[PDB]
Design a protein around this ligand. Sequence first.
Ligand SMILES: Nc1ncnc2c1ncn2[C@@H]1O[C@H](COP(=O)(O)OP(=O)(O)OP(=O)(O)O)[C@@H](O)[C@H]1O
Ligand SMILES: Nc1ncnc2c1ncn2[C@@H]1O[C@H](COP(=O)(O)OP(=O)(O)O)[C@@H](O)[C@H]1O
Ligand SMILES: Nc1ncnc2c1ncn2[C@@H]1O[C@H](COP(=O)(O)OP(=O)(O)O)[C@@H](O)[C@H]1O
Lengths: 102, 175, 247, 101, 250, 256
Amino acid sequence: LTKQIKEIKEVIELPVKHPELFESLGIAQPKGVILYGPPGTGKTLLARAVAHHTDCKFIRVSGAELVQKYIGEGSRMVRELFVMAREHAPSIIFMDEIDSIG
Amino acid sequence: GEITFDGIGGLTEQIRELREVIELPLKNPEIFQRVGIKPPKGVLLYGPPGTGKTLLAKAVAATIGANFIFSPASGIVDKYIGESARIIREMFAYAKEHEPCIIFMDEVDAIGGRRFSEGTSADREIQRTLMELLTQMDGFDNLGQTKIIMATNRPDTLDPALLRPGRLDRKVEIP
Amino acid sequence: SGAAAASAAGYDRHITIFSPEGRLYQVEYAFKATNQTNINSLAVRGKDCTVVISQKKVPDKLLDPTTVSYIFCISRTIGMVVNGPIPDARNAALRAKAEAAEFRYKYGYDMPCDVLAKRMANLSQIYTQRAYMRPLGVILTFVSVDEELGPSIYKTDPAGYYVGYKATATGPKQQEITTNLENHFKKSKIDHINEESWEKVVEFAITHMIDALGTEFSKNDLEVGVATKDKFFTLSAENIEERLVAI
Amino acid sequence: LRPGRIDRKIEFPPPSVAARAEILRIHSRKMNLTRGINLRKVAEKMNGCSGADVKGVCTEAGMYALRERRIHVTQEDFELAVGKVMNKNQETAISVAKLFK
Amino acid sequence: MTDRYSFSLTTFSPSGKLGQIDYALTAVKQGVTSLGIKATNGVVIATEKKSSSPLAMSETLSKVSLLTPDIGAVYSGMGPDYRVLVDKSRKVAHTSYKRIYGEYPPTKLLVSEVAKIMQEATQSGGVRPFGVSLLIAGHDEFNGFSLYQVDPSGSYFPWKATAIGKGSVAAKTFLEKRWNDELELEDAIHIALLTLKESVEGEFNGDTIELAIIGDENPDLLGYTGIPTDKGPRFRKLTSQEINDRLEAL
Amino acid sequence: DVGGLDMQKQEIREAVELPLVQADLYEQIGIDPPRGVLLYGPPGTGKTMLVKAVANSTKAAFIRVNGSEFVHKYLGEGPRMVRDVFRLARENAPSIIFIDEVDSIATKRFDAQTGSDREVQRILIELLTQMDGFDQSTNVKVIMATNRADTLDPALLRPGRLDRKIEFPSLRDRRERRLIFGTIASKMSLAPEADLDSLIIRNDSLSGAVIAAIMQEAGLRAVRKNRYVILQSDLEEAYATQVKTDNTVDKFDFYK
Ligand SMILES: Nc1ncnc2c1ncn2[C@@H]1O[C@H](COP(=O)(O)OP(=O)(O)OP(=O)(O)O)[C@@H](O)[C@H]1O
Ligand SMILES: Nc1ncnc2c1ncn2[C@@H]1O[C@H](COP(=O)(O)OP(=O)(O)O)[C@@H](O)[C@H]1O
Ligand SMILES: Nc1ncnc2c1ncn2[C@@H]1O[C@H](COP(=O)(O)OP(=O)(O)O)[C@@H](O)[C@H]1O
């Protein structure tokens, strides 16, 4: 599969590599994707592989690392994430997510 | 003494069988090796509450002619919060050089505490106090000059992280 | 874990609900009722004569002991003894006594204890299908001296299980008794018992529910039945005075 | 799932047969790959309904050679691999008979 | 945790499934092992008798039972939901089919008249189903020998060689290791007891076992010699000694 | 010290012993090692003890733990566990794990209409994540024990997770039954008139745990008979001890 790639590097790298373009094209940068499909297809593969060829850094959170068993120990933890992004900007985040299940 | 009195009521086959469970490995145990088997390093005595077994184990080791000592598992964790397991090893060394001898210790379900209920480094006492127990009883070699007894009401509440497989091998209910 | 998910998640108050273990529990809770008297009967075969024995307790003095009895002469050639509370014994006794009859009105002879344990047990099943009725908290024994089979004992429980034993007891104290005649049979390898007279076979069955029961018995604490061809009836008190004199 | 948080999304389906052929060449780049192979066929003998079950196959094939102490393989050492991931998935949990049409 | 779509029957869950049937089929798998397999010239039906106490005469009650001379059965699971079933099954031959066709029925039309006696009790609350199963097996003269299963749901899967109860898959694993296409009855019979020597404990004699056959007519069981065409039964329960020699031939 | 059980042993020597002391094997061929395995089959069968021996030869570390411990009532007090051990099972590498029960917390479910059972998925999905996500390679951690294998999630059986099913006897394996008796007996001293061939076929169902419950009831009464040596007749009173039909506790009241 390679067509799938072309959408990633269209959203990820172009607003980072040289985004003067969008100011000519008169639209808004994008800010995320999501990727679905059965297991055993190679989706968590790709995010390991995207790291090699970024030039921008990388963050990873399997689900269930957020939870910390107290009331707000979790929602303090997400916020402790994003601030660690901005100072280290630019940055990418990768997430298996079921905290947002339900 | 080797001739001591034990004549309270209630129970006969128990005092009859512990005599089997515990006498022979102490008096002339040079046979358990050449026959082949390994004797039991330890024992457990479970049942319902309100039964008067503290005096029982106090008694039957006294008629047999064994040096008996007994300590609850409360003061070792009540008086001594974070200076406990020092007492354990001393309780054996003292017990060693006075070989042979029997142990008894009730409220044994207190060592669990958290039982690593969260794995935080605040319950090191409730964790290590199980550790030094196990490492020491493994150090006996089970020759036949030191044996151990434990007891509680809730063996289903027990900590089979150890004391189940081969340490407190023989489990014995009571009527 | 056994009944923990039972006592919490229903499964113990409706009859017609299975548990994921497969077990339904209501009928499995009926049997606790059978032992609510602390009573313990017995039954054995003969060459042609059958017997059943029961305690008959010594409560407060005001009773009239002629009527306290768990031995119900159903029809002729038939009889039964219960294990459980009295009221839930009658409704089984009476649903029968009007059932042997219509047979004899509709088929031309008297029922055996075979059918009478298959019929009444073909009903206690039904009442564990529908919600007509709480299953009767009993377990009841039958006796007879049949023409085609000889002596015969049968037994029935609130589910519907029925088998014709060779000898048996029941109540809170089966293990003690049952061993004190299971071992007896492997001695001799006779499904029945000797001592032709219905007299002499009683004293066999008394003494086995003395040594293995746990005490000594008078004439008043007992009540005893018997089955012989053409009849079923109850008895007098001298049969033990003509025991201990011999011993 | 709104735009403003995830502006597009992706479907990763399981592959075609001609699709899978390239998945094996990459997993087999370090295997020895004796000559007379048509691994455009092995895909067709068993559609790997995943895209990673094959990663066990190309592994599983070499495992035979290990047992024999051979280093290399041929087509045969693949043609039995399909016997394990596919058939033993149908002979894994299809073992009821009670069912309802 | 519970499910709140299982305490009752008329309720669907989001997977489009019903509650209590799924557990009744577990009430049998917890029960004893019983079976019946097939042959070219007959059918066999077997099970054992896990006699509870030693004092229970294990002969006054038959796992196996006759429905018509050409048709017999056996259960696996609960008992009282068997002898209450058959007593209203064999009737239905004598009520729905016989009296308006003269003769006893085929083997599958009997099953249809069982399985709705099984399905009347899974359509209205206030009725537990029959926590049992069945293996009906018989014969007739346009489709031939047969074998049939009957679950509590009212479905009747047919079969060739099968078993049920706790010791099922161990047995079903074994049949096709021994089963064929052209097999004969007296060859298909010692199979169906060496199948049962594995799913057992303790004693393995005629007084802890009982089974059946189907075959050619057994007119000696018939009783009324003198008619040319009324060939008698086709179903006979093998006595103890008739079994208790075959084991010593094995 | 173990009994017999020859080919079952042979397969984990392939899966576990080789990848820790031999790796050029798996490299030059053009593959990667298999990750862990599972050991299905009825209990009292030497599963756990085998895995202990495996450590004892290869000298590597060992972590024993039970699956009913990962479950916990405080939210997130479980997946902290499953992630904590790996944080150290790497540290003391090379290392492996045994789990004497995982069918408890592992079974297919069509959906969760509940809050508690949803966390059981949060348990598992981290376990399934740690092996497959980026990590080290010397761990061969997972050795899933159980009593059956017809219940697990095939998403746990995705090749890469587990690829070596393993099976052990249940009963009727007279060969594997007799074979252990000599081994345990090889430890003990017996008289020559002490034959055990009377014992094997007399049974119809037992296991490998009971036999030790028999031997340590066989060679226990000799000393009660104050003899330096055992005889035969002590034995026959044991096979009744570790036999069937101790007591019909609730055998009849269950269904009927
Ligand atoms: N096209 C491919 N090239 C190489 N490997 C592949 C490919 N497709 C699948 N795989 C294999 O599939 C596995 C990865 O599976 P995948 O990452 O899709 O599951 P996952 O995304 O980890 O599931 P989840 O994220 O829900 O835990 C790897 O072992 C990889 O070798
Ligand atoms: N069998 C017995 N004989 C005499 N006294 C008994 C007996 N069982 C219990 N007791 C009474 O109960 C008390 C001892 O019970 P205790 O040692 O507290 O039981 P446990 O150690 O299980 O808590 C004493 O006062 C004793 O008199
Ligand atoms: N083949 C065998 N050889 C030696 N011991 C055995 C054998 N099979 C079982 N055992 C005994 O079984 C016990 C361990 O059983 P175990 O493997 O823990 O059961 P499970 O696998 O269900 O946990 C040990 O004490 C061991 O002596």
